[PDB]
Every structure is written in C-alpha cells, then in structure tokens.
Design a protein around this ligand. Structure first.
Ligand SMILES: CCCCCCCC/C=C/CCCCCCCC(=O)O[C@@H](COC(=O)CCCCCCCCCCCCCCC)COP(=O)([O-])OCC[N+](C)(C)C
Ligand SMILES: CCCCCCCC/C=C\CCCCCCCC(=O)O[C@@H](COC(=O)CCCCCCCCCCCCCCC)COP(=O)([O-])OCC[N+](C)(C)C
Ligand SMILES: CCCCCCCC/C=C\CCCCCCCC(=O)O[C@@H](COC(=O)CCCCCCCCCCCCCCC)COP(=O)([O-])OCC[N+](C)(C)C
Ligand SMILES: CCCCCCCC/C=C\CCCCCCCC(=O)O[C@@H](COC(=O)CCCCCCCCCCCCCCC)COP(=O)([O-])OCC[N+](C)(C)C
Ligand SMILES: CCCCCCCC/C=C\CCCCCCCC(=O)O[C@@H](COC(=O)CCCCCCCCCCCCCCC)COP(=O)([O-])OCC[N+](C)(C)C
Ligand SMILES: CCCCCCCC/C=C\CCCCCCCC(=O)O[C@@H](COC(=O)CCCCCCCCCCCCCCC)COP(=O)([O-])OCC[N+](C)(C)C
Ligand SMILES: CCCCCCCC/C=C\CCCCCCCC(=O)O[C@@H](COC(=O)CCCCCCCCCCCCCCC)COP(=O)([O-])OCC[N+](C)(C)C
Ligand SMILES: CCCCCCCC/C=C\CCCCCCCC(=O)O[C@@H](COC(=O)CCCCCCCCCCCCCCC)COP(=O)([O-])OCC[N+](C)(C)C
Ligand SMILES: Nc1ncnc2c1ncn2[C@@H]1O[C@H](COP(=O)(O)OP(=O)(O)OP(=O)(O)O)[C@@H](O)[C@H]1O
Ligand SMILES: Nc1ncnc2c1ncn2[C@@H]1O[C@H](COP(=O)(O)OP(=O)(O)OP(=O)(O)O)[C@@H](O)[C@H]1O
Lengths: 541, 663
C-alpha cells in the first residue's frame, strides 16, 4: 500500500521472479561472507604447525565452488531483477500511450504536448529505475550493512568493529551534504548553458540580418562572453565535485588505519589472530558499496514519489467522455437533422438545420463565426452543448462511436498525414495524374497532400463525407471538377462541403451562411443572390 | 585526417594544467600505494617479529624483555651484538605461545604433548622443552614493538591526509583543462561559422548547426573527462600497484601481470557485443519516440479513422525487438561487469593461497603474511576501476564521431575571408550588368538581369514566384556570387571588394522582423555599440505611441522576453533598426501574404518615413501601396519581362497589367 502498491501491481502478477530474485540475492549476501573468513583461516593454519597438502587442496576447492556458486546465482538473480525492469518499462509505455489513444482532444490536446512526451521517457525511466535499482539498494543497504556489521561483530570482535565503523556514518552524511549542494549549483551550469544555446540559436537563425549590418564580430564577442559564463559555472560545480573522491579516500583510509592499528593493539593483548586481521580488512573492503547504495536509495525514493505522481495524474485522474451512452442507435445515418444545437468548445447559439440521404450540401460564412463547430461536434471530439443532433429522432449521445466514425469520411482543413509512404496513407481523386508528376515516394505540395487526404477519406466509401476547406489550395477549375466528380459518383450519398470560396458551397443543395454567433439565413444559391451584400459572385471573375 | 591527432593537438594547448595535474596525480598515487607497504612492514616486523630468535641479554635495557627469569633481546634489535650467546625461540602452536630456551636446528610441524615441544618435519631434529607464554608474558614481549606500532601508524595517517590534497588538486586541474579546451574549441567553431558562406546555412537547418556548436562540444568535453579522469588515472594506478607488487614479490607479480591480457580480451569482446546491443536500442528508442510523436498531434484524426487500434501492431513489432535487445544487453552485462570482477578476485585469492602453501609450507618455511596482506590490499585497489574502464572504452565511439563532426566543420576550406568596413555613403547608385546567376549547376535562375537604379528610391521588384526576386537580394548582399556578368555600386565592381564593405552600404527590413531576445533599444540598435541617443530618436519618430503604454523601450523594457506583441509593432521595430543603421541602399523583401488587418496602415506611415532620402528596393507583391515607385520592374522566367513607371506599364499592358488586373 502507499508507495509499495503504487508500483507493486507490476510484480504482484510476477511474484515468482520478484521473490526468487530476493531469495538468491540474500543467499549471495550470506555466502559472500565466507571467502574472507576462509582466507583468514588458511593464514592461521599456515602459521600453526598443522598444514598439509590436503588442507590446501580442500581450500582451493571450496574457494572455486564458492566462486562458481556466486557467479551462477548472480548471473541468474540479477538477470531476473533487471529483465523485470525491462518488462516494467514495456508495460508503462504501453499503458501510458493506451490512455493517450483511448481519449479525446477537448482538454488533453489543450494540455501541452511537451509534458506528454516528457512523461513517456523521463518518468517511465524514473519508475523503472525505482523498481529495479531502488530495490537493489534497499536490499544492499538495509541487510548487507547489517549482515557485515554482525559478521565482523560476532566472528572478529565487537571492539574492532565499532572503531573501524565509526567513520562511515560521517562519510555517508558528508556525501548527502555534498549532494545537497552539487545539485543546487548544477542548475546554474545547466541553465547558463541553455542560455548560451538560446543565444547561439538566435544568432544562427538571424544570420542574414547579422551579416547584413556587419555585426558578426559583436556576435562573436557576445558568444565568447556566454562561453566564459558557462565555463565559470562549470568550475563552480567542479570545485564541489572534486570533494567526492578525496572524502571517500580519507574516510576509508581512516577506517583501514583504525582497523589495522587497533587490531595490532588487540593482538598484542591476544584477542585476535593475524588471519582474523586479514579477514576483517577484506570485510572492510567489501563494505564500501552500501555507503553509496544508501544515498542512491534515498535519492531514488525521493524522486519517484513525484515522478510517479506525474504519470498517475496523466494516466488515472483523467476522466472525460470518449465513449457512447445507451444501446439506442440508428443503423442508417442517411438523414441528419439538427435541433437547437448549441455546441461549445472546451461558438454556437441556437443553430438548427437539416440534411437528407443523398444530399450534397454546402456551408460558408465569415471569419470568427462558427463554421468548424458544426462538423466538429458531429465528429464527437468535444463536450456537447444544448439542443440535439439526431440522425433520425434521438439525441446524439446514444449514437455508437465505432459506427459513427466509420460512417464519416472527413478531410480536415489543417491536414495531417501519418504513414511515411502515400500508399500506406491511402490504405489508411484526380491523383492518377499526380502519380505521373513530381512524386509511392514518402510523406513528411500542400494541394497534392490535400488531394491525398480527399482520396483517403473517399476510400472509406462513406455515407457522411465532410470536407472542411479542402479545396482552398487547388484552383477553381480543379475544385469544380473535384466536386462534380464526387457528386456524380456519390449521387445517392450525403456531403457537407465547407470552404471559404462561395462558389461550390451554395448551389449543390443549400447554403447555411453563418455570421457572428447565429445564422445569417438558411437559403440556397438562388436565394443567396437576393440577400444582403456579401461575398457574392462579384469577387470571382 | 585523424580525430586523435587533432584531439592531441588541442590538448597540447593548456598543457601547463595537464602536466601539473598528471604530476600531482602521480605523486598522490605513489603516496597512497605506499600505505599497504607500511602495513606489510608493520605486520611482518612487529606483530610477526616475535618469531625471530631471542638472546639472553639484560644488557640492552629499555628494550630487553623480562621472562620469569633472565631478560631477553631480539636478534636484529641487538644493540650490543654478542653473536650466538644464548639461543632462544618463541614458537606458536595452535593458539598457545611457547618459549624454548635452547638453539633449534630446524623448523616445521610443531607438536606439544606435555610441555616438550617437538619439531620433526620428517627429520626429528631434536625434542625441546617449552613453557606456556601465559598472558601477561606475551604482552610483555609485545610492548617493545608498541612504539613502532604507533610510529608507522602516524606515518600512514600522515600520508593519507597528504594524499587527500594531492588527490583533490589533480582532479580539479584536469577539469579546468578539459573545460578550457572545449571553450577554445567552441570559440574556433563559432569563428569559423562567421566565415561560412550563406549557402552553408541555406543547405542546413539551424538545429543541426547549433548542435554542432554546443551539444557536440559538450560530448567532446565528456570525451576529455573520460580520457583523463578514467584512462590516465586508472593506468597510473595500475602502473604503481604493479610496481609495488614487483618490489614485494616477482613470481606472484608475474601472475598478477598476467591479468592485463584478460582485461584486454574482456574489453574487446564486451565492446564487440555492446556495440550491437546499444546501437539496436538507441535506434529503436528513436523509432519509438518518432512513432509516439507522429501519433499524438493527430488525436483528432487517429481517433476518427481505422488506426486508433492499429498503431499498437507496428509499435509492438518494434517494441518487442527493443525489449529483446535490452534483455540481450542485460545478458552480456551478466556474463561480464561486477560478475567477472568477483570471479577474478576469487581466482586471485586462490592464486595467493596456492602459491604460498605450495612454495612455502611445502618447504615448511619462508612465509611472509605481511606480503600476503599487502597483496590483498593491492589487488582490492586494482580491481575497482575495471568496470568503468570497459564501460568507457565501449562508450568512446559516439564521442569519437561527434569530435569528427566538429573537426569537419572546423576544417573545410570553402569560407569567406573579409572584415573590412567602408568609409563613405555610396548615394545608392547601384547598377547591374547582364548578371547570369546559377544556384546549383547549369540551371540558371537569373537571365541577364541588367538595370541601373538611380538615387531615386523605390525601384520596386514585383513579379512571379520562382522568378528571381529573392535572387536579387541575395546578389545585392553577395550572399551568393552570380558566376557571370557584373554588379556595380558607383561603378565599382561588386566582385572586387569586401563583403563587409559591401553590406556596410545596404540595409534590409525582412518580411520576418528578427526580434533578438533582449531589450527593444538594443534590438533596434542590434547591439551596435556605436549609437547612443539616435536609437530612441529614430524609434520614437514613428512608434512614439508604443512607449506610452509601459516604461521605455530603450530603457530595458521587456516585451521581447518571448521572441516577439503586434506584428505591426514587430515590423515597425525592424524599420527603426533599418533607419538607425541608416544605409545608403535599402532593400524591402516584404512578403505579406496574410495582411494583419489595418495595422499595416501605420506600417505604410513608417515606410514613407524611411524610403525617402535613399535608394530603396521594395520587393513587394501588393502593386497598390507602391504606385509611386520610380521604376517598376516585373520579373518572370528569370528575365526582366517589363520595366517602366507606374503608368508606363498601364499603357503597354503586359505582365504588370496581368497582375494588376487581378486587382
Ligand atoms: C502463521 C500465521 C497463521 C496464519 C497462516 C495463514 C497462511 C499464511 C501464509 C502467508 C504466505 C504469504 C501469503 C500471500 C497471500 C496469499 C495470496 C497470494 O499470494 O496470491 C498469489 C496466489 O495465491 C496464493 O498463493 C494462495 C496460496 C494459498 C491458498 C491456495 C491453496 C494452497 C494451500 C496451502 C497450504 C497452507 C494453507 C492452508 C489453508 C487451509 C498470487 O496472486 P496475485 O498475483 O497476488 O493476484 C491478486 C492480486 N492482483 C490481482 C493484484 C494480482
Ligand atoms: C542536533 C539538533 C537537531 C538537528 C538534527 C539534524 C539531523 C541531521 C544531521 C545534520 C545534517 C544536516 C541537516 C540540515 C541540512 C540543511 C541544508 C544544508 O545542507 O545546510 C548545510 C550548509 O548550509 C549553510 O551553509 C547555510 C548558511 C548558514 C549556516 C552557516 C554555514 C557555515 C557554518 C561554518 C561557519 C564557519 C565557522 C565554523
Ligand atoms: C576517442 C579517442 C580517439 C579516437 C580516434 C583515434 C584515432 O583516430 O587514432 C589516434 C589514436 O588516438 C590517439 O592516440 C589520440 C587520442 C588522444 C588525444 C589526447 C587526449 C588527451 C590526453 C591516432 O593517434 P596518433 O597520435 O596519430 O598515433
Ligand atoms: C616540479 C616538477 C616540474 C616538472 C616539469 C614541468 C615542465 C613545465 C610544465 C609544462 C610543460 C611545458 C612544455 C613547453 C614545450 C615547449 C615546446 C618544446 O619545444 O618542447 C617540446 C617538449 O619535448 C621536448 O622538448 C623534446 C624534444 C622534442 C621532441 C618531440 C616531443 C617528444 C616528447 C617526449 C617528451 C617527454 C614526454 C613526457 C610525457 C609525460 C614540445 O614537444 P611537443 O610535441 O610539442 O609536446 C609534448 C607534450 N608532452 C611533453 C606533454 C608530451
Ligand atoms: C621506486 C621506484 C621504482 C624502483 C625500481 C628499482 C629498480 C630495480 C631494483 C634493482 C636493485 C639492484 C639490482 C640492479 C628494509 O629492509 O629496507 C627497506 C626500507 O626500510 C626502512 O624504511 C626502515 C626505516 C622505516 C621507515 C618507515 C617505514 C618506511 C616504509 C616504506 C614503504 C616502502 C616504500 C617504497 C616502496 C613502495 C627498503 O625497501 P622498501 O622501501 O621498504 O621496499
Ligand atoms: C617523535 C619522536 C620519535 C622520533 C622518531 C623519528 C623518526 C621519523 C621517521 C618518520 C618517517 C619517515 C618519513 C617522514 C616524512 C613522525 C611519524 C610521521 C608523522 C606523520 C606526518 C608525517 C608523515 C609524512 C607525510 C608526507 C610527507
Ligand atoms: C598539491 C595540491 C595543492 C592543492 C591545490 C589545488 C588547487 C586549488 C584551486 C582552488 C580551489 C578551487 C576553487 O575554488 O576554484 C578557483 C580556481 O581559480 C582560482 O581562483 C585559482 C586558485 C586561487 C587560490 C590560490 C592558488 C591555489 C591554491 C594554492 C595553495 C598552495 C599550493 C601548494 C602546493 C605545493
Ligand atoms: C613487465 C615485467 C617485465 C618482465 C621481463 C622480465 C625478464 C624476462 C622474463 C622472461 C620470462 C619468460 O617467459 O621466459 C621464461 C622461459 O620461458 C618460459 O616461460 C627479473 C624480472 C622481474 C622484475 C621486473 C621488474 C619490473 C618493475 C616494473 C614493473 C611494472 C609492470 C607493470 C607495467 C624464463 O623462465 P621462467 O619465467 O622461470 O619460466 C616459467 C617458470 N615457472 C614454470 C616456474 C612458472
Ligand atoms: N480549437 C478551438 N478552441 C476554442 N475555440 C475555438 C477553437 N476553434 C475555433 N474556436 C472559436 O470558435 C468560434 C467560432 O468560429 P470558428 O473559429 O470555430 O470558425 P471559423 O474560423 O469561422 O472557421 P474555419 O475554422 O473553417 O476557418 C471562434 O470565435 C473561435 O474563437
Ligand atoms: N537555396 C536555394 N538553392 C537553390 N535554388 C534556390 C534556392 N532558393 C531559391 N532558389 C531558386 O531561385 C529561383 C528563384 O527563387 P526566389 O526565392 O528568388 O523567388 P521569388 O521570386 O522571390 O519567389 P517567391 O514568390 O516564393 O517569393 C528559383 O529557381 C528557386 O528554385
């Protein structure tokens, strides 16, 4: 529970490899205390009279088998405990972007894409590192410390141990204090380097102006100043950084010297042997890692608590409507009737219009007036407003999402292509000629890509085809030919043409001119001629 | 060209710091390594000195130990040598220590039955009496050494503190060295970037160049830190430790020296496999990021199509391979790293035990546990940095390629050599003569563009896209060379002067007002450092309303803390800069495809202020706000289709009529 379960669900279903790993790790922890004591015993047996070839052969055999045992147990348990990290990384990626897809864009695409892309790498790495490395540090800093402490407090002495151990708490606290400031002074270097990067980018984008007014030497003078500041920050950080190795060297040599001097003193009182001295020194040698492991543990367990709160907020707290409501549904979308719709973005005010099966309709208007809000709501990507959008008679919400999106064939004004080849963008229109032109090559000409979007939307063979300013890039003749061809092919199918040009969105079936926050009128092309002075055929030869 | 050669040539600079660091590190390593040698002496000569023969002597007082009877003195501590005198020993059996008051002819297996110590070793040299050393007696035989125990200890202590300083300094010094080299590097790079043809930045994005300036030089910084703080330090620590081992013992030193080939083969194969296993995760994570980014801004389209659930397919096709190679890297780590370190460490314990037992107690003697302890400490020190060594050796290649990139940038010879400004106002008499400019090869873009703009300003260049309107600006500032024809200013060939001189006559107000981050006053001045009060005057003359809102634009006012405000105010600042710099010739590469409402009105109010009293080139496409131009020129096909006044083209119809007919 709390910080335990927050990651524990991962190996709650994987307890086998996250418990065998712990067991093998503790077995290695205990077994690793043998080689030093065996070496000390070999020394003491050499010193005494009793020593034969059998003891030597026995000692080399036991050392070999202990080596092989530790080598296999590590190669297996650490393999499991880091394959677990790999699997947790793979799980967190999958779950994060699965939430991404199974969502809508009303308030999420509002949220900065920078945060969303930074999560999926930074925080995934942070949490996976928690699970693996933080657990390893916990094991080697809560037990390995206590195990070695007691191995030297029961098998060597309870006097030499405390003496040779007193400096290590000081070492750990000094390491923590140094880390408390190196990070504080690392922000300075990183952000000054960022400022130099910003200035270099600003000087490299505006090269034409810089060289136009012959200021490049000033620029070089400005670039050198910032480089000097970056160097100065790096020095203010290296000053502290160079205090790490000296302090560990000092407080490990002090440990070794206390051990050796006090051990010789005790031996002079016949409380140890020499083999015990060698074994205790080997123990001191093997006790270095936990002192850094404790710091790594605390760092990771302090970082993860927030680096996982982030993922939790961008994975679970998100509660929006991306799914439909009641089984209620209309198998056929032929007719579309609006009723007092007041859709708003996360716009419309008392809008009402009608469409019918096999009706090529067009909509136009001015700028700043709801024109995308009409079809955008029909795509179910933003919260619904007042009124009703019924395909036959019932509210919009009951319409299923899968069937709805399958019916719509949409071409967006802000066109976007994903697949790297046009063939896959169409497997996802007058382009038979574009094939015999400059470009199935690759994606990522605006008009050509709009044509690709048109072909892709048409390939659905849909029943409600929405075109949103999809003909503003091509010529008037080209768009006229496109609309004529689609109307002839899709004679018995509905269309919702939308474009700034008031030529292909009036005479098809009807024009719903939108002005301000309400409708100007619901007439047709012929009625549009006799109406308020507006963008009529005067502005188009 | 070799990367290493230039890296060494760059390191030779700031060589004083490098030599100081190397020598400080060498002395610190020696001082530290001398510690385990002190421990060996302090064990063998003091703790294990009791084994040496003892002689009956109350003469050398203050160091002659007292048994229950007469007092004794060590062999080598015999200040008044008496030669044989009375031979005595203190032997060790199990835990007990036994005093033998008689000469012994052999050493070997020691057995005690009833106070009669027996040493035979298969020879039965003799049977000797013995007396248990009790507890106080054993301590009395240990007191003479206590002083030495303390003394050497202090020595150890001393050196430690000493080494600490000699360990700090060097590292710090190394840091400076590397950093300073990078600084040098960066400077040179940037200098060479200011000698680069505009083609360089035309055929390359800004991100690439900035990365080649800063991020690559940071990679080179890390390369220098890797080479110095890891390879040099590790090599020095290996040389010192091996020397100490060779001083201690030879054959065991030959065994220890037999590990360098082991590290060589370990590193070779680890790199050979880690190259695979790390390239094939860096590339795959790049693919992962590309897929995730290409499928997030299309949340409105991916949702409304048949791919909200098909992305998973090809992704996981990539992701399973990513995780598979992650696990392969984990396997390679498992068969190496700390694991092989511990395997070798246990093999070293085995080597120590085998050698000592088989060569010392097979002959029943010549055992030095001080040498054992020193070897143990030395090999513990040795086996620390192997993992870092192999890791850095594997990592070196990316730094190698980044350094190669920066060297290629620093090395190419196609650069522009100039820097000389002018000393007069040209009066804007720019002339052209059958310029035939070709961009890549053979595909000419300008066809004998010949004309002569007089001091009368506003020679507007309004024409067709893909014609050469921007080529005119590029050749005017010599951003490119025409490769034919000629261009002149007051009869002076453009291709026989200096670029800085040429651009010192002409300014520009580009369609995209560059608002360099900082203060507005410096922005308009472009940090000139040669105008003090004219900037505010030439700004207020046209944008006098803007300061009325908040503070003073020259007075470090900061509406430009986001790389700016209103686009009109953005183009107005550009105009103010162009006026303050006050060139003779003036080019307006104005491209307003989407005019921002009526804000352009004041913009026109600004243009008339600046265009006057100059030789202005207005590369516009409105053909309505420039109806007072002294010479309209229309450009299509790369050749001057038509030229004339604002009215002389209306009479002749032509391309100008065609465009102005789309009024
Ligand atoms: C000494 C004190 C006195 C009390 C002693 C009481 C016993 C103390 C024992 C303590 C040991 C630790 C127990 C851990 C919790 C058990 C459940 C568990 O581990 O789940 C595991 C499987 O489920 C099992 O392992 C059940 C095993 C026992 C019941 C099955 C019959 C075997 C009887 C054996 C004979 C002995 C018992 C005979 C009983 C008549 C894994 O499931 P999960 O992955 O976690 O899925 C749920 C969570 N999730 C959905 C998020 C994934
Ligand atoms: C025992 C009573 C209860 C406390 C329990 C503490 C438990 C934790 C134990 C102790 C571990 C440390 C815990 C606190 C950490 C605070 C942040 C920090 O890193 O400060 C560090 C420095 O901070 C400064 O230097 C601030 C400047 C003012 C202080 C004076 C510094 C110069 C002292 C020298 C002046 C020169 C003359 C000498
Ligand atoms: C990454 C490291 C360099 C990789 C390329 C090395 C190369 O091309 O060969 C160089 C190896 O390398 C050297 O001998 C020079 C590299 C070290 C330069 C000194 C660094 C500071 C100490 C050849 O160097 P050389 O001096 O021509 O022999
Ligand atoms: C208190 C303790 C004080 C200690 C002394 C403090 C001294 C003052 C501190 C800073 C050093 C200042 C050096 C100034 C150099 C001036 C230029 C010159 O002519 O000299 C030449 C030096 O080498 C020779 O003079 C030998 C003759 C040239 C043969 C080619 C070099 C052979 C390298 C073998 C020489 C031994 C190699 C040693 C390797 C570790 C320059 O040769 P280089 O090729 O251009 O660069 C070599 C750089 N290196 C020497 C670092 C490799
Ligand atoms: C060196 C550079 C390479 C040389 C290559 C030589 C070329 C090859 C060799 C060629 C040989 C000739 C044939 C040709 C006692 O026995 O004497 C010893 C000192 O003894 C004392 O120091 C007594 C006084 C104690 C002082 C305090 C402890 C000093 C510890 C000092 C700790 C050792 C410090 C030095 C070793 C790290 C002398 O031996 P050692 O010094 O103890 O060893
Ligand atoms: C006192 C009364 C007894 C006189 C005994 C005189 C024997 C003096 C021999 C001292 C050892 C030889 C080397 C000395 C240097 C004093 C012991 C060293 C003090 C530690 C600090 C100096 C360690 C060296 C630090 C690195 C320079
Ligand atoms: C041998 C190791 C000596 C350790 C010394 C290691 C070197 C210490 C450098 C300074 C510490 C880092 C820092 O604060 O950055 C500022 C670096 O730039 C400066 O301001 C230069 C240093 C100024 C102080 C005086 C000289 C260095 C200390 C000279 C002290 C006397 C040295 C006597 C040597 C026998
Ligand atoms: C490098 C060191 C240089 C080594 C060179 C030493 C001289 C040549 C040795 C030849 C050995 C050889 O292979 O020939 C052998 C014949 O073939 C059969 O194997 C005296 C040398 C040691 C002291 C060096 C001090 C260096 C101080 C600095 C160190 C710095 C080191 C780190 C930089 C010779 O006979 P053997 O060897 O007796 O044969 C095996 C015997 N065995 C079966 C019992 C095992
Ligand atoms: N993504 C959006 N989020 C919030 N409000 C929006 C969004 N897109 C448009 N609006 C607002 O919708 C109101 C109605 O006009 P809208 O901008 O939707 O259509 P339009 O610009 O006339 O049409 P088109 O997008 O086809 O050019 C405008 O005031 C605009 O502020
Ligand atoms: N970086 C370049 N490398 C090669 N050719 C180029 C480059 N930039 C432009 N050109 C070529 O220069 C010729 C004219 O381009 P220019 O930019 O001068 O046109 P423009 O008349 O200003 O057009 P626009 O209406 O887009 O402003 C065309 O052949 C174009 O392909």
């Amino acid at each position: 529970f709390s910080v335990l379960k927050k990651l524990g669900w991962f190996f709650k279903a994987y307890w086998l490899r996250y418990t065998i790993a712990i067991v093998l790790l503790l077995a290695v922890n205990v077994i690793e205390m043998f080689p030093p004591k065996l070496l000390g015993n070999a020394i003491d047996d050499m010193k005494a009279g009793a020593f034969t070839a059998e003891g030597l052969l026995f000692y080399i055999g036991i050392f070999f088998v202990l080596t092989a045992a530790v080598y296999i147990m590590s190669y297996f348990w650490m393999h499991q405990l880091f394959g677990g990290a790999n699997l947790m990384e793979k799980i967190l990626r999958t779950k994060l972007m699965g939430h991404l897809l199974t969502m809508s864009p009303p308030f999420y695409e509002k949220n900065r894409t920078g945060d969303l892309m930074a999560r999926g790498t930074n925080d995934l790495q942070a949490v996976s590192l928690t699970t693996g490395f933080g657990i390893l540090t916990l094991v080697d800093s809560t037990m390995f410390m206590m195990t070695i402490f007691l191995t030297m407090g029961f098998l060597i002495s309870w006097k030499l141990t405390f003496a040779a151990i007193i400096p290590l708490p000081v070492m750990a606290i000094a390491i923590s204090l140094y880390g408390s400031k190196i990070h504080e002074r690392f922000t300075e270097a990183q952000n000054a380097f960022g400022a130099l990067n910003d200035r270099v980018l600003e000087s490299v984008s505006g090269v034409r102006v810089i060289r136009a007014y012959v200021q490049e030497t000033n620029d070089v003078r400005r670039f050198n100043e910032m480089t000097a500041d970056v160097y100065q920050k790096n020095m203010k950080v290296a000053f502290i950084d160079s205090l790490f190795e000296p302090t560990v060297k000092l407080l490990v040599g002090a440990s070794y010297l206390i051990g050796l001097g006090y051990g010789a003193f005790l031996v002079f009182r016949n409380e140890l042997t020499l083999g015990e001295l060698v074994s205790f020194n080997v123990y001191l040698g093997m006790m270095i890692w936990p002192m850094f492991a404790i710091g790594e543990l605390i760092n990771v367990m302090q970082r993860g608590n927030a680096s996982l709160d982030r993922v939790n907020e961008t994975l679970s707290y998100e509660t929006d409507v991306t799914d439909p409501k009641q089984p209620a549904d209309l198998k056929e979308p032929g007719d579309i009737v609006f009723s007092h719709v007041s859709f708003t973005y996360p716009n419309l005010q008392d809008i009402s219009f009608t469409v019918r099966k096999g009706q090529t309709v067009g909509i136009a208007g001015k700028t700043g007036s709801g024109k995308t809000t009409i079809i955008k709501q029909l795509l179910r990507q933003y919260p619904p407003g007042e009124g009703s959008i019924t395909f036959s008679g019932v509210p919009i919400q009951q319409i299923p999402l899968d069937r709805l999106r399958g019916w719509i064939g949409y071409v967006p004004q802000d066109h976007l292509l994903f697949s790297r080849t046009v063939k896959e963008n169409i497997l996802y229109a007058h382009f038979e000629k574009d094939l015999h032109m400059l470009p199935e090559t690759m994606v990522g000409s605006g008009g050509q890509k709009q044509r690709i979007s048109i072909a892709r939307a048409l390939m659905a063979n849909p029943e409600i085809l929405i075109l949103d300013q999809s003909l503003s890039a091509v010529d008037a003749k080209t768009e006229a030919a496109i609309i004529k061809n689609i109307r002839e092919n899709r004679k018995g199918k509905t269309t919702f043409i939308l474009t700034h040009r008031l030529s292909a969105v009036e005479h098809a079936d009807l024009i719903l001119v939108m002005d301000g926050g309400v409708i100007a009128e619901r007439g047709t092309h012929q009625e549009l001629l006799a109406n308020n002075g507006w963008y009529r055929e005067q502005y188009e030869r | 060209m070799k990367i290493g050669k230039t890296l060494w040539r760059y390191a030779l600079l700031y060589r004083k710091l490098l030599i100081t660091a190397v020598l400080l590190l060498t002395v610190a390593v020696g001082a530290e390594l001398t510690g385990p040698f002190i421990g060996k002496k302090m064990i063998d000569d003091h703790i294990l000195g009791i084994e040496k023969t003892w002689y009956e002597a109350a003469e050398k007082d203050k160091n002659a130990v007292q048994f229950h009877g007469v007092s004794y003195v060590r062999e080598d501590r015999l200040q008044e040598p008496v030669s044989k005198a009375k031979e005595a020993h203190i032997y060790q059996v199990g835990m007990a220590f036994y005093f033998v008051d008689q000469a012994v002819s052999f050493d070997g297996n020691r057995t005690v039955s009833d106070g009669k110590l027996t040493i035979t070793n298969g020879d039965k040299s003799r049977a000797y009496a013995a007396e248990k050393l009790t507890k106080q007696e054993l301590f009395q035989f240990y007191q003479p050494e206590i002083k030495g125990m303390v003394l050497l200890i202090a020595l150890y202590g001393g050196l430690l503190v000493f080494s600490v300083f000699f360990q700090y300094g060097q590292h710090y010094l190394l840091q400076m060295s590397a950093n300073r080299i990078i600084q040098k590097m960066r400077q040179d790079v940037f200098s060479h970037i200011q000698k680069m043809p505009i083609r360089y930045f035309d055929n390359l994005p800004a991100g690439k160049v900035v990365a080649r300036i800063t991020n690559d030089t940071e990679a080179i910084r890390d390369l220098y830190v890797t080479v110095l703080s890891t390879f040099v330090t590790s090599g020095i620590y290996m040389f010192g430790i091996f020397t100490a081992l060779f001083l201690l013992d030879v054959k065991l030193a030959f065994v220890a020296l037999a590990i360098v080939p082991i590290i060589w083969l370990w590193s070779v194969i680890y790199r050979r496999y880690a190259s695979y296993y790390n390239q094939k995760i860096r590339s795959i994570n790049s693919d992962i990021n590309a897929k995730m980014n290409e499928s997030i801004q299309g949340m409105t389209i991916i949702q409304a199509f048949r791919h909200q659930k098909e992305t998973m397919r090809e992704f996981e096709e990539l992701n399973e391979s990513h995780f598979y190679f992650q696990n392969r890297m984990l396997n390679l780590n498992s068969l190496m790293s700390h694991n092989l370190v511990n395997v070798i460490r246990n093999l070293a314990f085995v080597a120590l035990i085998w050698h000592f037992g088989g060569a010392s107690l097979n002959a029943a003697g010549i055992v030095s546990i001080g040498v054992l302890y020193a070897f143990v400490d030395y090999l513990n020190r040795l086996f620390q940095p192997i993992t870092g060594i192999v890791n850095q050796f594997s990592k070196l290649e990316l730094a190698r390629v980044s350094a190669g990139r920066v060297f290629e940038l620093l090395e190419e010879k196609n650069t522009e050599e100039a820097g000389e400004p002018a000393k007069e106002r040209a009066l804007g008499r720019v002339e052209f003569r059958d310029v035939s400019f070709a961009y890549q090869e053979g595909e000419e873009v300008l066809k004998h563009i010949s004309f002569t703009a007089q001091k009368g300003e506003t020679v507007a260049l309004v024409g067709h896209t893909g014609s050469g309107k921007s080529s005119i600006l590029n050749l005017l500032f010599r951003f490119y060379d025409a490769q034919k024809g000629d261009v002149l200013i007051d009869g002076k060939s453009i291709y026989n002067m200096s670029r800085q001189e040429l651009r010192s006559h002409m300014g520009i107000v580009l369609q995209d007002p560059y608002l360099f981050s900082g203060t507005i006053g410096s922005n308009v001045s472009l940090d000139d450092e040669r105008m003090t009060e004219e900037e505010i005057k030439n700004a207020l003359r046209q944008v006098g309303a803007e300061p009325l809102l908040k503070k003073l634009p020259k007075g470090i006012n900061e509406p430009v803390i986001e790389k700016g405000l209103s686009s009109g105010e953005r183009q107005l600042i550009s105009f103010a800069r162009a006026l303050a710099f006050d060139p003779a010739i003036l080019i307006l590469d104005q491209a307003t495809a989407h005019i921002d409402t009526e804000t352009e009105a004041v913009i026109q109010k600004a243009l008339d202020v600046v265009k006057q009293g100059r030789t202005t080139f207005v590369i516009a496409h409105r053909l309505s706000t420039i109806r007072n131009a002294d010479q309209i020129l229309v450009l299509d096909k790369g050749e001057i289709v038509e030229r004339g006044n604002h009215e002389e083209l209306m009479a002749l119809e032509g391309q100008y009529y065609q465009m102005y007919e789309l009024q």
